[PDB]
Amino acid sequence: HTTPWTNPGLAENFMNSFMQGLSSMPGFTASQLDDMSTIAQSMVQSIQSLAAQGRTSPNKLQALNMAFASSMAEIAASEEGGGSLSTKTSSIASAMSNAFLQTTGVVNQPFINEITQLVSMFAQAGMND
Amino acid sequence: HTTPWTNPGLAENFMNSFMQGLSSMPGFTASQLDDMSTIAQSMVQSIQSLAAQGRTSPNKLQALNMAFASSMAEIAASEEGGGSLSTKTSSIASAMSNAFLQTTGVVNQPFINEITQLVSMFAQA
């Protein structure tokens, strides 16, 4: 059960792989990708800082991986333009699948399912006020 | 720039206020509260770094505030012990309410409801 929350290096590699893959995928504008990359790099940096202090654990990395994926889902759902919501959702799922394959070598389907659900939940709910 | 979703200093205030509120609530072990505090501290520092570089925006702050809330929901849902799922849920909702009062003075109830829904979704997964 190697996952992106097994250790800091896999967590960082997963996030970087996701962004790399997404940026060749349909459905997103250049500024949407820029926002996602900015957040991705801030989270990689946060993990590097925690790791330097011996403050990561699988539970903390699992939560941080959810922080990352939920940020991506939120950007997808809230920034208008670039493609249909279903295209955005399928591109996120494809980029996550590839990110697993490139890093741990093993897709976590339950995680991909959670994130696709987040896209629809966030699109319906939204963020106003 | 009057809410945590548009003002980095208010976003940082909201996250610190959430943790302060949660630390007086039931349902979490000391280890779980440590996990939550560590993640909150990380997120606050991330926003401070981005703000210093002019790299925050309303869309990016919205995304980061949701990232924070989802990470709290995921800890509640996945880490066993310390209290029932309902207690954990109620405690997060209370700490979120107080975090709004301490920042904007106006509770965003639909946002609180959305986080309560995340706790259940993550728990079922």
Domain CATH code at residue A33: 1.10.274.70
All residues of chain B having their beta carbon less than 8 Å from the beta carbon of residue A46 are 42-43, 45-46
A116 touches chain B (CB under 8 A): no
Q: How far apart are CA B55 and CA A30, in angstroms?
A: 16
Q: How many domains does chain B have?
A: 1
In a domain, A85, yes or no: yes
All residues of chain A having their beta carbon less than 8 Å from the beta carbon of residue B52 are none
Structure tokens at A45: 């940096």
> A6: buried, middle or exposed (CB in 10 Å: 19+, 13-18, 0-12)?
middle
> A34: buried, middle or exposed (CB in 10 Å: 19+, 13-18, 0-12)?
middle
**Which of B70, B113, B121, B124 is the best substitution to test chain A (most A C-beta atoms within 10 A)?**
B70
Cβ–Cβ < 8 Å for A43, A100? no
In a domain, A3, yes or no: no
Q: What single-letter amino acid sits at A94?
A: S
Residue-number span of the structural domain to which B27 is assigned: 8-125
Say whether B114 and A121 touch across the interface (CB within 8 A).
Answer: yes
Cβ–Cβ < 8 Å for A96, A87? no
Q: How far apart are CA A50 and CA A64, in angstroms?
A: 11
In a domain, B1, yes or no: no
Say whether B66 and A64 touch across the interface (CB within 8 A).
Answer: no
In a domain, B2, yes or no: no
Say whether A59 and B39 touch across the interface (CB within 8 A).
Answer: no
Structure tokens at B89: 């849920």
B57 touches chain A (CB under 8 A): yes
- Nearest CA to B10 out of B72, B42, B58 is that of B58
In a domain, A122, yes or no: yes
Min Cα distance B67 → chain A (Å) is 4
In a domain, A26, yes or no: yes
- Tell me, rounded to whole angstroms, the distance of Cα A83 from its chain centroid: 18
> B52: buried, middle or exposed (CB in 10 Å: 19+, 13-18, 0-12)?
exposed
Structure tokens at A102: 């490139």
Instruction: Report how many Cβ contacts below 8 Å link chain A to chain B.
Output: 97
Q: Which DSSP letter does residue B115 get?
A: H
Min Cα distance A13 → chain B (Å) is 19
Cβ–Cβ < 8 Å for A126, A78? yes
Sign of CA dihedral A93, A99, A102, A106: negative
Give the technique used to solve this structure. Answer: X-ray
Q: Which DSSP letter does residue A105 get?
A: S
Resolution in angstrom units: 1.7
